[PDB]
Design a protein around this ligand. Structure first.
Ligand SMILES: *[C@@H]1O[C@H](CO)[C@@H](O[C@@H]2O[C@H](CO)[C@@H](O[C@H]3O[C@H](CO)[C@@H](O)[C@H](O)[C@@H]3O)[C@H](O)[C@H]2NC(C)=O)[C@H](O)[C@H]1NC(C)=O
Ligand SMILES: *[C@@H]1O[C@H](CO)[C@@H](O[C@@H]2O[C@H](CO)[C@@H](O)[C@H](O)[C@H]2NC(C)=O)[C@H](O)[C@H]1NC(C)=O
Ligand SMILES: *[C@H]1O[C@H](CO)[C@@H](O[C@@H]2O[C@H](CO)[C@@H](O)[C@H](O)[C@H]2NC(C)=O)[C@H](O)[C@H]1NC(C)=O
Ligand SMILES: *[C@@H]1O[C@H](CO)[C@@H](O)[C@H](O)[C@H]1NC(C)=O
Ligand SMILES: *[C@@H]1O[C@H](CO)[C@@H](O)[C@H](O)[C@H]1NC(C)=O
Lengths: 413, 403
């Protein structure tokens, strides 16, 4: 047979002439390769997140799936070469995994992807909506497709851009929307794709989950949420008391982990103290700093106030991505995707992320009351009130993977 | 031949004294009992600290005093009727005992539900006294309480232990000292005793895998550990006035359910208890709508014991306790007819775990013994173990400390 979970480096053609070799640099029961990749992948998430945050206004929420983008450009990378391939490695930090080969990266995703989407449990409803779209006139390589299928679970789909340019756009949106249980409707904006369109990269991940420790709607109370602009608005502040992996870090910033049923996927909230600013924290937050904060998360009983929120971000990666160094892939001239063709470059890359958080969890709203008999909490107990902007992440703990990462700078409606 | 199957005018039951289908009375009885239950509970809490643990079988007390009533006469008989609210059952004194007997039948007599709810009533009289044949017969008829002789005159203490051991045997050792030492003395004539034992399986049991050790904070700043059980499922529930939560956890068979009452954390039982009445506890039950919810309740056990004298006197039962005014002539034929209740003791037990719940209780009315001078945490929650079809409160209390 040979599926994603049995794939061995031997089951992934190297393709000489097209292999990069990133420089050198001189805890588990968990797979090391997955460990290394997740670190390289989180390295890109925080980088990308920072650039993206800087380009945005503080009062704007944000939400994306860096794992998505990262995986999307990884399958694109599958058939990239030379200049194009290098930028792909360096931009997405895959080149930060010591002496690793552009070929091995794909083997790592094999391992990662195998566990993220297959070996996972029922509760870990994780759907990968990443596909490559190119015009029919182009002849695509079947070795690429076959590997892109095995590893990334998706082949490049040919669409009639030249002719049915607009008909294609709707074909794409119809497909992303299918996998995203309808949540990720439009994926490519209007007049985004046209006759000149050659290659289009779309990427999203869909997660559906229930809190392991639900909030009771009965305890939700409209509260003020202070924004960046110094103003205030009313949000539906959820409230509960429970045991959560928590941790007060540098300068009073609070890190809270709220797991979902399944236990492997959790939402981490980062709330700086009223004084310090989220922007200040977004800046200071680095891969190792974030990795550290998470390693220090210790179970603790606390009072949690959390605004109910909904965030939906529409991304056109191309700009920021090339602004970050990925220039060739988007270049009709400098581009080089020899493995994907049988002048091929990426026209644009679209990303859409969606998060709705309520008392039952992320995605759902099936009311549930909560009765806690015979509980007496310390009248001094530590509280976590998120009535000011805070970061958010959805990560697969065992895989040390950041699936989604966002910012809730305004939850109010 | 049988009090349960028999009928009013068909059974030869009719006490010495007296004072002013049938299921209307049986139901009026249960309401009287519940009314006594809630009233008595209030007086009981009223004398304790708002944060003291409290558990008891009000049904058990009513039964023991109903028994005592059989030999009561005049003022004492009237007071007994009024205090235990038997004076609200449209019917005379003698009558009551029939319905009560009917009630106990529809309560403890059944081979249905693994909802073990038994009860044993027994009399313990002085080995040398001559008890009234009629009293002794109605007692054994209506309440199934047989008279066991004991030497209170000479060797009393061994007798007090004799009784306590009998209650123990009747409640799976759960109640081990219903009667305090030194209460029964040489001049102790008789001891009326009731016992109730419950043991049910959660209709929707809790899994130990989900139970977790949590820290409880005693009001005094101190803190201890409390094993908390957890589970999600459909339950009749409701958040009432001032934010009080009422949860009904039925036992297998749905005939007996435990009703929890938790006031919003930023409030206390105080208001709830002072406003507690049968009608109220019923309104809440009538608001209970099934709902999907998460239940977090301590796997614990509490025991309580006490004298029913002070509070029962406060409630208006004074004569029965007055060595002078007490009137219990229908008890001893030859020996004495100056009997009075020295003291009334009660002891209840409640244990709750993943499997289910176990409650026991006993009440010991002591005739002419010694009136032994009346010999904790926070975030408490009320508990009731009721018999739904019969509308009776079997057990009830305030769990203030699950540690
Ligand atoms: C699609 O991509 C294919 C892989 O990148 C590519 O085929 C590759 O062709 C080269 C030579 O043209 C082979 O490289 C050398 O090794 C093989 C192995 O035995 C020899 O047979 C060759 O002669 C050569 O020395 C690659 O092995 C081969 N890749 C594989 C394993 O399939 C195609 O050219 C591209 N186009 C399509 C759709 O065929
Ligand atoms: C024992 O008690 C019974 C009643 O419990 C007594 O029986 C009769 O009770 C009626 C009450 O209406 C009196 O009018 C009778 O005089 C009582 N005796 C008769 C003639 O039946 C009985 O007196 C008591 N006897 C003992 C054992 O002391
Ligand atoms: C990118 O450029 C490199 C080198 O400039 C290409 O790889 C080698 O190119 C030289 C010059 O044509 C050849 O002599 C080698 O045989 C090539 N590789 C090998 C087999 O050693 C590379 O192919 C270019 N990228 C593509 C495929 O467009
Ligand atoms: C998406 O299409 C698949 C068939 O390939 C179907 O099973 C699934 O239910 C569809 N999603 C929606 C909109 O339910
Ligand atoms: C008590 O009741 C009896 C009849 O039950 C009656 O003869 C007597 O007058 C009453 N008074 C007292 C205090 O004995």
């Amino acid at each position: 047979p040979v599926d994603i979970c049995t794939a061995k480096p031997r089951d992934i053609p190297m393709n000489p002439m097209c292999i990069y070799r990133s420089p050198e640099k001189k805890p588990e029961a968990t797979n090391r390769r997955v460990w290394e990749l997740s670190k390289a992948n989180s390295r890109f998430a925080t980088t990308f997140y920072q650039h993206l945050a800087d380009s945005k206004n503080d009062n704007d929420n944000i939400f994306l799936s860096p794992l998505s983008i990262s995986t999307a450009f990884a399958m694109t990378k599958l058939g990239a070469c030379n200049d194009t391939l290098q930028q792909l490695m360096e931009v997405f930090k895959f080149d930060t995994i010591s002496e690793k080969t552009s070929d091995q990266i794909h083997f790592f995703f094999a391992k990662l992807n195998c566990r993220l989407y297959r070996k996972a449990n029922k509760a870990s409803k994780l759907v990968s909506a990443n596909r490559l779209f190119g015009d029919k006139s182009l002849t695509f390589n079947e070795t690429y497709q076959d590997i892109s299928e095995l590893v990334y679970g998706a082949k490049l789909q040919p669409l009639d851009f030249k002719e049915n340019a607009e008909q294609s756009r709707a074909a794409i949106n119809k497909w992303v929307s299918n996998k995203t249980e309808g949540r990720i409707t439009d994926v490519i904006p209007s007049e985004a794709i046209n006759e000149l369109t050659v290659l289009v990269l779309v990427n999203t991940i869909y997660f559906k989950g229930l809190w392991k420790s639900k909030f009771s709607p009965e305890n939700t109370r409209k509260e003020l949420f202070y924004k960046a602009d110094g103003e205030s608005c009313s949000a539906s502040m959820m409230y509960q008391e429970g045991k959560f992996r928590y941790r007060r870090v540098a300068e009073g910033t609070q890190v809270l982990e709220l797991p979902f049923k399944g236990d492997d996927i959790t939402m981490v909230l980062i709330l700086p103290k009223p004084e310090k600013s989220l922007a200040k924290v977004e800046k200071e937050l680095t891969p190792e700093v974030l990795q550290e904060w998470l390693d220090e998360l210790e179970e603790m009983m606390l009072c949690v106030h959390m605004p109910r929120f909904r965030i939906e971000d529409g991304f056109s990666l191309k700009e920021q991505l090339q602004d970050m160094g990925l220039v060739d892939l988007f270049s009709p001239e400098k581009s080089k995707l020899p493995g994907i063709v049988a002048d091929l470059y990426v026209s644009d890359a679209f990303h859409k992320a969606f998060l709705e958080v309520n008392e039952e969890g992320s995605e759902a709203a099936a009311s549930t009351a909560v009765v806690i008999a015979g509980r007496s909490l310390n009248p001094n107990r530590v509280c976590f009130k998120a009535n000011r902007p805070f970061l958010v992440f959805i990560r697969e703990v065992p895989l040390n993977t950041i699936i989604f990462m966002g910012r809730v700078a305004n939850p109010c409606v």
